[PDB]
Amino acid sequence: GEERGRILISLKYSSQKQGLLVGIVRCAHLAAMDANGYSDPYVKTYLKPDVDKKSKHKTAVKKKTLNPEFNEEFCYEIKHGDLAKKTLEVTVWDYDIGKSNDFIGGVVLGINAKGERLKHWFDCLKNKDKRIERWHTLTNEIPGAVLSD
Ligand SMILES: [Ca+2]
Ligand SMILES: [Ca+2]
Asked: Where is this region: Mediates interaction with STXBP3?
């Protein structure tokens, strides 16, 4: 997979809420998918398998930037023992008018991942009520997204 920028993600499993808090903090040096040399980025998240197709979250769109700051956090209600059953799919897109939005890149976290994609997830799961915030380099190859380039 080729690099498409970096994303800073925060994860915290809250015992009180019985929920995974997912923070989309900011991105750095995203791929430019517009004719002006920039992108209009937003980030989507899913928690999969998504029983009932309700896990979609999307950040606001930031205009004309390759270094967006989102500082948004969402929550997935889930018992701690089910966390290891799931993958967190985080994808970055470029909002366009007049055509479908361009895919920028993504990252998938889960116990079946590798390297820091695995370690970030594992660190969250093994440290309840501790926020773990880590950068990941985006890939251009996300299953179910677009063809690799
Ligand atoms: Ca575009
Ligand atoms: Ca655009």
From this structure: 2-112
